[PDB]
């Protein structure tokens, strides 16, 4: 457990329907939500692969469960019944435990993605912006839409706004 979902970001956004993890920007020119395309696409692909692995890895042969025995073959009938319930318990325990653990893996994956996105933005902004608490940065300079899109694309230019940030800090 990393500490993002329910941690320092204590709420989700119903308005961000384009993706799973994203940004909310507010400047003098506009405000709005925007999903992170790369992380969302990678997460979608990975979860699809997880579901397909849980489902398609089960191989089955043509089986004819169900046998008929007369009253003089009660022992073979009980042996067949024993095979049946043993398989039943094995499969029940395995399926329940597998789903219980896979849910943990999925939730931890989403938390790690949110934390990594926050860390990426933090390491890009450096001291050009301050951490004001709930997963948000206040810029020490003027971020227009181009500056924000640079932050969300991964190509932020620290030397360009460093001087303005130093002046306002």
């Amino acid at each position: 457990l990393f500490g993002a979902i329910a941690g320092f970001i204590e709420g989700g956004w119903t308005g961000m329907v384009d993706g799973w993890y994203g940004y909310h920007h507010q400047n003098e020119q506009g405000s709005g939500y925007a999903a992170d395309l790369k992380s969302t696409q990678n997460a979608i692909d990975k979860i699809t692969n997880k579901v397909n692995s849980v489902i398609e890895k089960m191989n089955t042969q043509f089986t004819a469960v169900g046998k008929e025995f007369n009253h003089l073959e009660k022992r073979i009938e009980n042996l067949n019944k024993k095979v049946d319930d043993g398989f039943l318990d094995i499969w029940t325990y395995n399926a329940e435990l597998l789903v219980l653990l896979e849910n943990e893996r999925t939730l931890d994956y989403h938390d790690s993605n949110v934390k990594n996105l926050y860390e990426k933005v933090r390491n890009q902004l450096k001291n050009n912006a301050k951490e004001i608490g709930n997963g948000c940065f206040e810029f020490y300079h003027k971020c227009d839409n181009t500056c924000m899109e640079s932050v969300k694309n991964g190509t932020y230019d620290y030397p360009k706004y460093s001087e303005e940030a130093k002046l306002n800090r």
């Epitope: 329907v17 384009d18 506009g30 395309l37 979608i44 181009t146 899109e149």
Partner: antibody
Framework: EKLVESGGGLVQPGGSLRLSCVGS????????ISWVRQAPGKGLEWLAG????????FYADSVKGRFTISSDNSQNTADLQMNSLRTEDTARYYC????????????????WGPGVEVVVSS | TVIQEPAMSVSPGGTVTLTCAFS?????????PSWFQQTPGQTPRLLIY???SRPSGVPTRFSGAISGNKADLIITGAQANDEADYFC??????????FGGGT
């Protein structure tokens, strides 16, 4: 495979009207159902959208407080209810389906219905 | 609002680009441009979604890109059945999904 719309006709200004959209060949569970109107001569206009499995309902600023969209996945139906209809609401309405994987909309309206004409002439 | 060219035409077998822009902003991949085709008197058909992806029925000659702060739909080798009205839908918010004027 297909979406069939019904419930069009002629209503008076200030009236109310309900359109229904029934989908066949697929399940409504893993899609978003939106309503798009095309006025005579003008272009398309997105009105409302519903993701029933996520329980999310979105409305345009033009039809907020007037239109209400509900969905039933069991019967594969999607209904749009219009109140306080104005004269500028006369158009051909389309029940459109948008793809959603794992609860995330991908902005892909892939299947459109034939559409139903609605006239609000007095 | 969304600004689109009101009309343009090409000779058969040629190439054309259709442009879709914002009135005051910039078009990005995060705006999810989508391109629909509507033959007069028929229901619209989805040609391109997410700026570069075509459904399993659209011919290869239809392509999409983002260029010069606008969304571009490229038709290479226009046939006679490509004469229709082309619409662009841009996603700005959950409640704001703006269709183009038409072409």
């Amino acid at each position: 495979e297909k979406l069939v719309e019904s419930g069009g006709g002629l209503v008076q200004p200030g009236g109310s009207l309900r359109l229904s959209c029934v989908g066949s060949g697929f399940t409504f569970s893993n899609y978003e159902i939106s309503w798009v109107r095309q006025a005579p001569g003008k272009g398309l206009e997105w009105l409302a959208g519903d993701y029933s499995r996520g329980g999310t309902t979105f409305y345009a600023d033009s039809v907020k407080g007037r239109f209400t969209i509900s969905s039933d996945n069991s019967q594969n139906t999607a209904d749009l209810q219009m109140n306080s209809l104005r004269t500028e609401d006369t158009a051909r309405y389309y029940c459109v389906r948008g793809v959603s994987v794992f609860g995330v909309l991908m902005m892909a309206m892939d299947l459109w219905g034939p559409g139903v004409e609605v006239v609000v002439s007095s | 609002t969304v600004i689109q060219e009101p009309a343009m035409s090409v000779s058969p077998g040629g190439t054309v680009t259709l442009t879709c822009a914002f009135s005051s902003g910039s078009v990005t991949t995060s705006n999810y441009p989508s391109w629909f085709q509507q033959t007069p008197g028929q229901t619209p058909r989805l040609l391109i979604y997410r700026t570069n992806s075509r459904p399993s029925g659209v011919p290869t000659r239809f392509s999409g890109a983002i260029s010069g702060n606008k969304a571009d739909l490229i038709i290479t080798g226009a046939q006679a059945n490509d004469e229709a009205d082309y619409f662009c839908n841009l996603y700005k918010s959950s409640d704001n999904r703006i269709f183009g004027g038409g072409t």
